[PDB]
Design a protein around this motif. Structure first.
Motif, PDB file in Angstrom:
ATOM      1  N   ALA A   1     -25.644  13.050   2.277  1.00  0.00           N
ATOM      2  CA  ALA A   1     -26.450  12.506   1.179  1.00  0.00           C
ATOM      3  C   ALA A   1     -27.172  11.160   1.488  1.00  0.00           C
ATOM      4  O   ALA A   1     -27.795  10.624   0.614  1.00  0.00           O
ATOM      5  N   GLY A   2     -27.040  10.626   2.705  1.00  0.00           N
ATOM      6  CA  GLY A   2     -27.750   9.464   3.153  1.00  0.00           C
ATOM      7  C   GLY A   2     -26.846   8.374   3.772  1.00  0.00           C
ATOM      8  O   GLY A   2     -25.633   8.427   3.690  1.00  0.00           O
ATOM      9  N   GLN A   3     -27.467   7.367   4.352  1.00  0.00           N
ATOM     10  CA  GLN A   3     -26.771   6.279   4.976  1.00  0.00           C
ATOM     11  C   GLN A   3     -26.172   5.380   3.929  1.00  0.00           C
ATOM     12  O   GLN A   3     -26.842   5.010   2.967  1.00  0.00           O
ATOM     13  N   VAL A   4     -24.922   4.985   4.156  1.00  0.00           N
ATOM     14  CA  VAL A   4     -24.292   3.967   3.338  1.00  0.00           C
ATOM     15  C   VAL A   4     -23.838   2.826   4.269  1.00  0.00           C
ATOM     16  O   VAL A   4     -23.182   3.108   5.279  1.00  0.00           O
ATOM     17  N   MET A   5     -24.134   1.567   3.889  1.00  0.00           N
ATOM     18  CA  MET A   5     -23.587   0.372   4.555  1.00  0.00           C
ATOM     19  C   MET A   5     -22.328  -0.051   3.813  1.00  0.00           C
ATOM     20  O   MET A   5     -22.348  -0.248   2.583  1.00  0.00           O
ATOM     21  N   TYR A   6     -21.243  -0.143   4.575  1.00  0.00           N
ATOM     22  CA  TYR A   6     -19.907  -0.545   4.084  1.00  0.00           C
ATOM     23  C   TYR A   6     -19.573  -1.964   4.533  1.00  0.00           C
ATOM     24  O   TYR A   6     -19.669  -2.277   5.736  1.00  0.00           O
ATOM     25  N   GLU A   7     -19.179  -2.786   3.559  1.00  0.00           N
ATOM     26  CA  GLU A   7     -18.699  -4.182   3.717  1.00  0.00           C
ATOM     27  C   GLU A   7     -17.189  -4.099   4.015  1.00  0.00           C
ATOM     28  O   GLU A   7     -16.431  -3.446   3.290  1.00  0.00           O
ATOM     29  N   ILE A   8     -16.756  -4.763   5.100  1.00  0.00           N
ATOM     30  CA  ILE A   8     -15.361  -4.658   5.659  1.00  0.00           C
ATOM     31  C   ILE A   8     -14.387  -5.627   4.952  1.00  0.00           C
ATOM     32  O   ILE A   8     -13.146  -5.588   5.149  1.00  0.00           O
ATOM     33  N   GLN A   9     -14.949  -6.539   4.143  1.00  0.00           N
ATOM     34  CA  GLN A   9     -14.124  -7.526   3.461  1.00  0.00           C
ATOM     35  C   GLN A   9     -12.958  -6.882   2.707  1.00  0.00           C
ATOM     36  O   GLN A   9     -13.144  -5.965   1.932  1.00  0.00           O
ATOM     37  N   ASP A  10     -11.743  -7.379   2.995  1.00  0.00           N
ATOM     38  CA  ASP A  10     -10.507  -6.919   2.373  1.00  0.00           C
ATOM     39  C   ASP A  10     -10.049  -5.547   2.782  1.00  0.00           C
ATOM     40  O   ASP A  10      -9.126  -5.078   2.159  1.00  0.00           O
ATOM     41  N   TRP A  11     -10.614  -4.901   3.798  1.00  0.00           N
ATOM     42  CA  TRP A  11     -10.162  -3.558   4.117  1.00  0.00           C
ATOM     43  C   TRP A  11      -8.669  -3.492   4.588  1.00  0.00           C
ATOM     44  O   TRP A  11      -7.927  -2.520   4.283  1.00  0.00           O
ATOM     45  N   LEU A  12      -8.230  -4.488   5.349  1.00  0.00           N
ATOM     46  CA  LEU A  12      -6.836  -4.459   5.861  1.00  0.00           C
ATOM     47  C   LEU A  12      -5.907  -4.579   4.705  1.00  0.00           C
ATOM     48  O   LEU A  12      -4.973  -3.858   4.605  1.00  0.00           O
ATOM     49  N   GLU A  13      -6.218  -5.456   3.771  1.00  0.00           N
ATOM     50  CA  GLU A  13      -5.359  -5.613   2.601  1.00  0.00           C
ATOM     51  C   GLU A  13      -5.393  -4.444   1.656  1.00  0.00           C
ATOM     52  O   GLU A  13      -4.362  -4.071   1.186  1.00  0.00           O
ATOM     53  N   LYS A  14      -6.544  -3.826   1.426  1.00  0.00           N
ATOM     54  CA  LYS A  14      -6.608  -2.586   0.599  1.00  0.00           C
ATOM     55  C   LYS A  14      -5.852  -1.469   1.247  1.00  0.00           C
ATOM     56  O   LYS A  14      -5.229  -0.720   0.566  1.00  0.00           O
ATOM     57  N   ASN A  15      -5.932  -1.336   2.571  1.00  0.00           N
ATOM     58  CA  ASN A  15      -5.269  -0.243   3.235  1.00  0.00           C
ATOM     59  C   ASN A  15      -3.725  -0.402   3.263  1.00  0.00           C
ATOM     60  O   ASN A  15      -2.980   0.564   3.086  1.00  0.00           O
ATOM     61  N   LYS A  16      -3.257  -1.617   3.488  1.00  0.00           N
ATOM     62  CA  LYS A  16      -1.814  -1.915   3.416  1.00  0.00           C
ATOM     63  C   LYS A  16      -1.300  -1.895   1.966  1.00  0.00           C
ATOM     64  O   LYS A  16      -0.140  -1.623   1.702  1.00  0.00           O
ATOM     65  N   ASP A  17      -2.151  -2.244   1.018  1.00  0.00           N
ATOM     66  CA  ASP A  17      -1.742  -2.167  -0.376  1.00  0.00           C
ATOM     67  C   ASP A  17      -0.369  -2.889  -0.689  1.00  0.00           C
ATOM     68  O   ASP A  17       0.533  -2.289  -1.300  1.00  0.00           O
ATOM     69  N   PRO A  18      -0.235  -4.176  -0.290  1.00  0.00           N
ATOM     70  CA  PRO A  18       1.083  -4.820  -0.441  1.00  0.00           C
ATOM     71  C   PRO A  18       1.440  -5.206  -1.880  1.00  0.00           C
ATOM     72  O   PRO A  18       0.575  -5.492  -2.686  1.00  0.00           O
ATOM     73  N   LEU A  19       2.734  -5.239  -2.182  1.00  0.00           N
ATOM     74  CA  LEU A  19       3.244  -5.879  -3.389  1.00  0.00           C
ATOM     75  C   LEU A  19       4.583  -6.597  -3.039  1.00  0.00           C
ATOM     76  O   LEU A  19       5.490  -5.958  -2.489  1.00  0.00           O
ATOM     77  N   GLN A  20       4.703  -7.888  -3.365  1.00  0.00           N
ATOM     78  CA  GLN A  20       5.975  -8.618  -3.191  1.00  0.00           C
ATOM     79  C   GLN A  20       7.144  -7.896  -3.845  1.00  0.00           C
ATOM     80  O   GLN A  20       7.101  -7.559  -5.017  1.00  0.00           O
ATOM     81  N   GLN A  21       8.179  -7.641  -3.057  1.00  0.00           N
ATOM     82  CA  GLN A  21       9.437  -7.090  -3.543  1.00  0.00           C
ATOM     83  C   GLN A  21       9.976  -7.879  -4.735  1.00  0.00           C
ATOM     84  O   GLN A  21      10.519  -7.330  -5.606  1.00  0.00           O
ATOM     85  N   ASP A  22       9.858  -9.207  -4.712  1.00  0.00           N
ATOM     86  CA  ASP A  22      10.315 -10.040  -5.854  1.00  0.00           C
ATOM     87  C   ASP A  22       9.627  -9.741  -7.201  1.00  0.00           C
ATOM     88  O   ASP A  22      10.216 -10.007  -8.259  1.00  0.00           O
ATOM     89  N   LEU A  23       8.408  -9.177  -7.135  1.00  0.00           N
ATOM     90  CA  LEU A  23       7.671  -8.689  -8.338  1.00  0.00           C
ATOM     91  C   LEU A  23       8.251  -7.402  -8.795  1.00  0.00           C
ATOM     92  O   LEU A  23       8.528  -7.218  -9.969  1.00  0.00           O
ATOM     93  N   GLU A  24       8.483  -6.506  -7.869  1.00  0.00           N
ATOM     94  CA  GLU A  24       9.210  -5.287  -8.211  1.00  0.00           C
ATOM     95  C   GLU A  24      10.602  -5.526  -8.794  1.00  0.00           C
ATOM     96  O   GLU A  24      10.987  -4.833  -9.762  1.00  0.00           O
ATOM     97  N   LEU A  25      11.339  -6.522  -8.250  1.00  0.00           N
ATOM     98  CA  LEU A  25      12.673  -6.820  -8.769  1.00  0.00           C
ATOM     99  C   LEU A  25      12.554  -7.342 -10.217  1.00  0.00           C
ATOM    100  O   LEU A  25      13.294  -6.908 -11.098  1.00  0.00           O
ATOM    101  N   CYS A  26      11.598  -8.237 -10.454  1.00  0.00           N
ATOM    102  CA  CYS A  26      11.385  -8.778 -11.775  1.00  0.00           C
ATOM    103  C   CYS A  26      11.095  -7.682 -12.840  1.00  0.00           C
ATOM    104  O   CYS A  26      11.647  -7.753 -13.957  1.00  0.00           O
TER     105      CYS A  26
END
Ligand SMILES: Nc1ncnc2c1ncn2[C@@H]1O[C@H](COP(=O)(O)OP(=O)(O)O)[C@@H](O)[C@H]1O
Ligand SMILES: Cc1ccc2c(c1)N=C1N(c3ccccc3)CC[C@@]1(O)C2=O
Ligand code: VO4
Ligand SMILES: [Mg+2]
Ligand SMILES: [Mg+2]
Length: 703
Positions: free
Chosen positions: A565-590
């Protein structure tokens, strides 16, 4: 019989209107015409030109304003006008782009949005209500073979249903479309229709599953006021007799980022506006609510309202649908508490303390979130700014700066929202899926191809799904079709239909050489990786090497992918963090210690809260997406597919406004004309020897 009565609502709204004596004269004319480009740089804008003379290899025609010549080989001939409005375009004498478009144009100008195009249905978005989806309409299509009735979403649905019955074979309806094209509206019609013609309270619950999913899962984007920000495969389940026995919804990754961030003019999910709009006086006091403009998660895009939509009134439709499916009164309140708390979490404002570490000076938003979630605010505060981690085996309390604290707060909000969404879907399926199925008709409604000013990781996964869905159309229509002719030596010269998404698919999802998603995964477990080492790694592998990849010269943080459907330009900002998708265990405990029984299930129910490992790491979002997609695709391969190509008229969400270039780009990348040509040139049907047609190694092949 309405089908034969020109006075019916059926003749009025589904059939080409009777032409007049003036039109008759034009139709019996001996004159012949050509579709041509007034401006040859603008290949999609055509006028009609009268052919005035011909040689053995050229036509001369008049232009609307002069006279021009054209090789007969490059000529786009206009069909005899008796074909204008034709219901199936494989009947056209001249199969070319402006002819096919013109036929869609003629039908659309009369609000005829459905047209067949060989074996599959085309649907062009009206962007207005058309009275073709009533019980009377449904009753009409019930049982009718495709050539007994006018093109309709109902008719393709009936055909899948009879194929299911007569063939003892599961079916799917694969509804294609860029964002806003009509996929979701058509999906709902397929469902309405299947539930009516095969129905026996379960039916109403199937129907009422939709408004709940849309409230929490759809939002205004710049492309669609009701954009689906999750994809779904819906199974309509039938007993052996052929009555609806239930349904089951598979949902695919929700765009959780929208909860915390929206682009200019967009909205957050509908549900947030609906609570704020339609809550009681005591809802608002118990939940500590105010107006959208009071919440950071609602006041950044500059849009809180959608034209023609009452959020307060939608709130009522969401509660009604929740009552009907079976969400108890305490459950619904719990749901809204979570909605409200997410809004309060959004308002927490971290500031720098004496040192580098964040502090909370004003605790109003923190206290209000903690109250509605039923968690301890002093514990939540500690978990946000001073979460505990292992360093080796040692237990070390961090002290997060403002940016990291704010981002950890975002992670907890997105996890609450994504887990609530999965919980909603789980709850719905427990109600709708109460018996084992014998058969299913699956209906696929994904997020459609999209391009914004800023495209991120979410857009890459959406657009890859759309690319894979196009390849699956190519595979059925052209590749499998011709392999049958080959394994049945039927005298068939192979045709290259030149529609192949493989190269783009491999670029994104290749494993050897690794594609984009594989390299993202590698960087994701690499302790020193940054969004800059990531883009570098991508350019290193693909720049000047993959034909579908572009390293832009105007940017150091973007890469381009050439999609069907055509060319798309993708911005790489935050890709490592979106892909890892972290959440502090201490938030889960709370939140595990929440006094709210819904909140508690989101954090303790392992089927909602647990996350798979790959060795020493949690599964990445790319790896999960890949799993869901392969599982989706394998399900489809077990079905007989029916294709509906939805087509957007313009990029303004307006009725009565076909834009030439918009529509033709869709017809080209969809492979609509190629799809009509395989229908015409080929051999649709074949039976093992049974006891302009042809005899194969084990089958007679006809037309
Ligand atoms: N058959 C239709 N009749 C009336 N309006 C439609 C129809 N199809 C689409 N629309 C309109 O276009 C909007 C976008 O349609 P939708 O199905 O949500 O898009 P998508 O392809 O993104 O799922 C709808 O909310 C509705 O306004
Ligand atoms: C397999 C498979 C099918 C369909 C989809 C899918 C995945 N993922 C999608 N989206 C996504 C969002 C954030 C991150 C990654 C993906 C959002 C829409 C989405 O649910 C979809 O249409
Ligand atoms: O705008 V749609 O994401 O529902 O394709
Ligand atoms: Mg949709
Ligand atoms: Mg840019």
């Amino acid at each position: 019989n309405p089908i034969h009565d020109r006075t019916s609502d059926y003749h009025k709204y589904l059939k080409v209107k009777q032409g007049d004596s003036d039109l008759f004269k034009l139709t019996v004319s001996d004159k012949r015409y050509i579709w041509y480009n007034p401006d040859p740089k603008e290949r999609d804008s055509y006028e009609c030109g009268e052919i005035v003379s011909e040689t053995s290899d050229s036509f001369t025609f008049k232009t609307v304003d002069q006279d021009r010549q054209v090789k007969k080989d490059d000529a786009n001939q206009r069909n005899p006008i008796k074909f204008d409005g034709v219901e199936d375009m494989s009947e056209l004498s001249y199969l070319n782009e402006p002819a096919v478009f013109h036929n869609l144009r003629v039908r659309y100008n009369q609000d005829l949005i459905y047209t067949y195009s060989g074996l599959f249905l085309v649907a062009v978005n009206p962007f207005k209500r058309i009275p073709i989806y009533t019980q009377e309409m449904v009753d009409i299509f019930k049982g009718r073979r495709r050539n007994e009735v006018a093109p309709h979403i109902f008719a393709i649905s009936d055909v899948a249903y009879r194929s299911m019955l007569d063939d003892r074979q599961n079916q799917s309806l694969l509804i294609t479309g860029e964002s806003g094209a009509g996929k979701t509206e058509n999906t709902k019609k397929v469902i309405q229709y299947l539930a009516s013609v095969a129905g026996r309270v379960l039916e109403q619950q199937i129907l009422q599953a939709n408004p709940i999913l849309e409230a929490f899962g759809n939002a205004k984007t710049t492309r669609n006021n009701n954009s689906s920000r999750f994809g779904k495969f819906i199974e309509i389940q039938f007993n052996s007799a052929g009555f609806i026995s239930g349904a089951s919804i598979q949902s695919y990754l929700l765009e959780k980022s929208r909860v915390v961030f929206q682009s200019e003019t967009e909205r957050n999910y509908h549900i947030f506006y609906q609570l704020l709009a339609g809550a009681t006086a005591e809802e608002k006091k118990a939940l500590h609510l105010a107006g959208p403009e009071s919440f950071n998660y609602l006041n950044q895009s500059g849009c809180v309202d959608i034209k023609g939509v009452s959020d307060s009134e939608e709130f009522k439709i969401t509660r009604q649908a929740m009552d009907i499916v079976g969400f108890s009164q305490e459950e619904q309140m719990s749901i809204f508490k979570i909605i409200a708390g997410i809004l309060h979490l959004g308002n927490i404002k971290f500031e720098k303390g004496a040192g580098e570490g964040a502090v909370l000076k004003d605790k109003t938003a923190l206290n209000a979130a903690s109250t509605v979630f039923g968690v301890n605010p002093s514990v939540l505060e500690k978990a946000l700014m001073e979460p505990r981690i292992l360093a080796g085996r040692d237990l070390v309390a961090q002290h997060l700066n403002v940016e990291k604290s704010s981002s950890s707060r975002d992670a907890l909000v997105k996890a609450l929202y994504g887990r609530l969404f999965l919980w909603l879907v789980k709850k719905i399926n427990n109600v709708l899926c109460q018996e084992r199925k014998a058969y299913f008709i699956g209906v696929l409604d994904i997020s459609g191809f999209e391009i914004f000013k800023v495209n991120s990781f979410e857009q890459l996964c959406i657009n890859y799904t759309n690319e894979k869905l196009q390849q699956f159309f190519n595979h059925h229509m052209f590749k499998l079709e011709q392999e049958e002719y080959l394994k049945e030596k039927i005298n068939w010269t192979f045709i290259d239909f030149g529609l192949d998404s493989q190269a783009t698919i491999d670029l994104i999802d290749g494993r050897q050489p690794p594609g984009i998603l594989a390299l993202l995964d590698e960087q994701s477990v690499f302790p020193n990786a940054t969004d800059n080492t990531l883009i570098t790694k991508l350019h290193s592998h693909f720049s000047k090497k993959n034909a579908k990849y572009e390293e832009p010269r105007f940017s150091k943080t973007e890469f381009g992918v050439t999609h069907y459907a055509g060319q798309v330009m993708y911005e790489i900002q935050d890709w490592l963090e979106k892909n890892k998708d972290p959440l502090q265990q201490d938030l889960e405990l709370c939140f595990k210690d929440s006094s709210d029984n819904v909140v508690t299930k989101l954090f303790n129910d392992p089927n909602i809260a647990s996350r798979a490992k790959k060795g020493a790491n949690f599964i990445t979002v790319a790896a999960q997406y890949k799993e869901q997609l392969a599982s989706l695709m394998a399900t489809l391969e077990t079905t007989n597919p029916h294709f509906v190509r939805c087509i957007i008229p313009n990029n303004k969400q307006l009725p009565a406004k076909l834009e030439d270039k918009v529509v033709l780009d869709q017809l080209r990348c969809n492979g609509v004309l190629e799809g009509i040509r395989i229908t015409r040139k080929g051999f649709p049907n074949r039976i093992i020897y049974f006891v302009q047609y042809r005899f194969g190694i084990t089958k007679i092949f006809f037309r």
